[PDB]
Design an enzyme around this catalytic site. Structure first.
Site, PDB file in Angstrom:
ATOM      1  N   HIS A 295       1.158  -1.169  -0.043  1.00  0.00           N
ATOM      2  CA  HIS A 295      -0.149   0.292   0.227  1.00  0.00           C
ATOM      3  C   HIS A 295       0.998   1.281   0.203  1.00  0.00           C
ATOM      4  O   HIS A 295       0.684   2.544   0.054  1.00  0.00           O
ATOM      5  CB  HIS A 295      -0.662   0.057   0.984  1.00  0.00           C
ATOM      6  CG  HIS A 295      -0.756   0.243   2.681  1.00  0.00           C
ATOM      7  ND1 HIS A 295      -0.492  -0.850   3.649  1.00  0.00           N
ATOM      8  CD2 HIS A 295      -0.440   1.312   3.276  1.00  0.00           C
ATOM      9  CE1 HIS A 295       0.099  -0.488   4.291  1.00  0.00           C
ATOM     10  NE2 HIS A 295       0.414   0.735   4.534  1.00  0.00           N
TER      11      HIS A 295
ATOM     12  N   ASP B  92      -0.021  -7.571   1.020  1.00  0.00           N
ATOM     13  CA  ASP B  92       0.475  -6.319   1.110  1.00  0.00           C
ATOM     14  C   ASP B  92       1.407  -6.363   1.435  1.00  0.00           C
ATOM     15  O   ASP B  92       2.256  -6.052   2.733  1.00  0.00           O
ATOM     16  CB  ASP B  92      -0.100  -5.905   1.874  1.00  0.00           C
ATOM     17  CG  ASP B  92      -0.357  -4.148   2.604  1.00  0.00           C
ATOM     18  OD1 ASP B  92       0.165  -3.722   1.593  1.00  0.00           O
ATOM     19  OD2 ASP B  92      -0.549  -3.606   3.405  1.00  0.00           O
TER      20      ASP B  92
ATOM     21  N   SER C  23       3.678   2.151   8.928  1.00  0.00           N
ATOM     22  CA  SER C  23       3.696   0.971   7.201  1.00  0.00           C
ATOM     23  C   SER C  23       4.618   0.664   6.978  1.00  0.00           C
ATOM     24  O   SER C  23       5.553   1.139   6.459  1.00  0.00           O
ATOM     25  CB  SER C  23       2.570   1.883   6.529  1.00  0.00           C
ATOM     26  OG  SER C  23       1.551   2.003   7.039  1.00  0.00           O
TER      27      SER C  23
HETATM   28  C1  LIG Z   1      -3.363  -0.390   4.407  1.00  0.00           C
HETATM   29  N1  LIG Z   1      -4.304   0.017   5.555  1.00  0.00           N
HETATM   30  C2  LIG Z   1      -5.695   0.075   5.372  1.00  0.00           C
HETATM   31  N2  LIG Z   1      -3.835   1.824   5.202  1.00  0.00           N
HETATM   32  C3  LIG Z   1      -2.925   2.024   6.297  1.00  0.00           C
HETATM   33  C4  LIG Z   1      -3.070   3.090   6.383  1.00  0.00           C
HETATM   34  N3  LIG Z   1      -1.843   4.050   6.634  1.00  0.00           N
HETATM   35  C5  LIG Z   1      -1.243   4.706   5.878  1.00  0.00           C
HETATM   36  C6  LIG Z   1      -1.326   6.485   6.335  1.00  0.00           C
HETATM   37  O1  LIG Z   1      -1.354   6.913   7.010  1.00  0.00           O
HETATM   38  N4  LIG Z   1       0.318   6.934   5.872  1.00  0.00           N
HETATM   39  C7  LIG Z   1       0.415   7.869   6.564  1.00  0.00           C
HETATM   40  C8  LIG Z   1       1.998   8.734   6.244  1.00  0.00           C
HETATM   41  C9  LIG Z   1       2.463   9.306   7.047  1.00  0.00           C
HETATM   42  C10 LIG Z   1       2.237  10.111   7.580  1.00  0.00           C
HETATM   43  C11 LIG Z   1       0.265   9.766   7.536  1.00  0.00           C
HETATM   44  C12 LIG Z   1      -0.066  11.257   8.180  1.00  0.00           C
HETATM   45  C13 LIG Z   1      -1.797  10.597   9.083  1.00  0.00           C
HETATM   46  N5  LIG Z   1      -2.273  11.686   9.804  1.00  0.00           N
HETATM   47  N6  LIG Z   1      -1.660  12.799   9.300  1.00  0.00           N
HETATM   48  C14 LIG Z   1      -1.361  13.937   9.779  1.00  0.00           C
HETATM   49  C15 LIG Z   1      -0.172  12.608   9.009  1.00  0.00           C
HETATM   50  C16 LIG Z   1      -0.047   9.076   7.084  1.00  0.00           C
HETATM   51  C17 LIG Z   1      -1.145   3.289   8.237  1.00  0.00           C
HETATM   52  O2  LIG Z   1      -0.055   4.082   8.421  1.00  0.00           O
HETATM   53  C18 LIG Z   1      -2.548   2.256   8.511  1.00  0.00           C
HETATM   54  C19 LIG Z   1      -1.482   3.382  10.447  1.00  0.00           C
HETATM   55  C20 LIG Z   1      -1.756   1.976  11.340  1.00  0.00           C
HETATM   56  C21 LIG Z   1      -1.457   1.137  11.861  1.00  0.00           C
HETATM   57 CL1  LIG Z   1      -0.395   0.317  10.658  1.00  0.00          CL
HETATM   58  C22 LIG Z   1      -1.688   0.393  12.594  1.00  0.00           C
HETATM   59  C23 LIG Z   1      -3.407   0.773  13.689  1.00  0.00           C
HETATM   60  C24 LIG Z   1      -3.633   2.028  12.992  1.00  0.00           C
HETATM   61  C25 LIG Z   1      -3.095   2.648  12.238  1.00  0.00           C
HETATM   62 CL2  LIG Z   1      -4.428   3.887  11.353  1.00  0.00          CL
HETATM   63  C26 LIG Z   1      -2.286   1.498   8.453  1.00  0.00           C
HETATM   64  N7  LIG Z   1      -3.012   1.176   7.049  1.00  0.00           N
END
Ligand SMILES: CN(C)/N=C1/CN(CC(=O)Nc2cccc(-c3cnn(C)c3)c2)C(=O)[C@H](Cc2c(Cl)cccc2Cl)CN1
Length: 224
Positions: A41, A83, A176
Site C-alpha cells: 500500500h 500487502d 506502514s
Molecule cells: C493498509 N491499511 C488499511 N492502510 C493503512 C493506512 N496507513 C497509511 C498512512 O496513514 N500513511 C501515512 C504516512 C505518513 C503520515 C500520515 C499521516 C496521518 N495523519 N497525518 C496528519 C499524516 C499517514 C497507515 O499508516 C495505517 C497505520 C495504522 C496502523 Cl499500522 C495500525 C493501527 C492503526 C493505523 Cl491508522 C495502516 N493502514
C-alpha cells in the site's frame, strides 16, 4: 509507534524511510544492498529512500532514489491481502555499523514469540505527533484463532497478528511497511490495525513474511 521507546542506537540498521520528497510516507526494511521490502500500500512512482540513520530527515543519512516497485500481484486494495512489495534501489547502499540487511525467515515463528516492530509513525492517536527518533515496540505473536476473535473475516491466511495483552504498545500512521523482527528474522511488515491506534487488545496486523519466501527470492534472483 504508540507507547514505544527510542530504538537503541545501531540495533535496527535495516530500517529505512520511504520518503515522498522529504516527507515520511512509509517504513521499509533493507533485505540486500539493492532491495527494500515494504507494504504494497506504500507504492509510489518514485521514492527517496533514507538509510543508515535513526533520525527521520537526517541530512547526513544516505538518500537513494528508487523508481521500480514490484508489488505482489495478489495485492488487494479492498481486503489488503498480500500487502507486500519489493523496491529496487537506483544505486546500491554501502553497508556499515548503521546499514545492514535483515535476515529473511526460513521458518514461521509461532504464537507467543517475542518480537520488535519499529517506525517513525505518530506516537499519539487520533491527534498526531511525529517523532525524530526511530521508535520501537515490543510485541508478541498472536495466533490466528485468537486474532480472529477480534477481526473476524478481515483476517486473511497470510496476515500475522502481534501485540501485548492490555497494552497500548502498537503501530500507527506512518509505521506502514516497517519491520517486525522476531528471533533475529523478519516475520512481518506493518500492514494495519484499528483506529484510533493503540487500543488495548486490538492487535497490530502484519503481512506474514515467511509465507512469501518463494516470491521474494524469485523477484530478487540475479542468476539462471
Ligand atoms: C493498509 N491499511 C488499511 N492502510 C493503512 C493506512 N496507513 C497509511 C498512512 O496513514 N500513511 C501515512 C504516512 C505518513 C503520515 C500520515 C499521516 C496521518 N495523519 N497525518 C496528519 C499524516 C499517514 C497507515 O499508516 C495505517 C497505520 C495504522 C496502523 Cl499500522 C495500525 C493501527 C492503526 C493505523 Cl491508522 C495502516 N493502514
Amino acid at each position: 509507534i504508540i507507547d514505544g521507546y527510542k530504538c537503541k542506537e545501531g540495533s535496527h540498521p535495516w530500517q529505512v524511510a520511504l520518503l515522498k520528497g522529504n516527507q515520511l510516507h512509509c517504513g521499509g526494511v533493507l533485505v540486500d544492498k539493492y532491495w527494500v521490502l515494504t507494504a504494497a500500500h506504500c507504492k509510489m512512482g518514485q521514492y527517496q529512500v533514507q538509510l543508515g540513520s535513526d533520525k527521520i530527515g537526517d541530512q547526513s543519512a544516505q538518500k537513494i532514489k528508487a523508481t521500480k516497485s514490484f508489488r505482489h500481484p495478489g495485492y488487494s486494495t479492498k481486503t489488503h491481502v498480500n500487502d507486500i512489495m519489493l523496491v529496487r534501489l537506483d544505486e546500491p547502499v554501502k553497508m556499515s555499523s548503521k546499514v545492514e540487511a535483515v535476515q529473511l525467515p526460513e521458518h514461521c515463528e509461532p504464537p507467543g514469540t517475542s518480537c520488535t516492530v519499529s517506525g517513525w509513525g505518530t506516537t499519539t492517536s487520533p491527534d498526531v505527533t511525529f517523532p525524530s527518533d526511530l521508535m520501537c515496540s515490543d510485541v508478541k505473536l498472536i495466533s490466528s484463532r485468537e486474532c480472529k476473535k477480534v477481526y473476524k473475516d478481515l483476517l486473511g491466511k497470510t496476515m500475522l497478528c502481534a501485540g501485548i495483552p492490555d497494552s497500548k504498545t502498537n503501530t500507527c500512521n506512518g509505521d506502514s511497511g516497517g519491520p517486525l523482527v522476531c528471533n533475529d528474522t523478519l516475520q512481518g511488515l506493518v500492514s494495519w490495525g484499528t483506529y484510533p491506534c493503540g487500543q488495548p487488545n486490538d492487535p497490530g496486523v502484519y503481512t506474514q513474511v515467511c509465507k512469501y519466501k518463494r516470491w521474494v527470492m524469485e523477484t530478487m534472483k540475479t542468476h539462471r
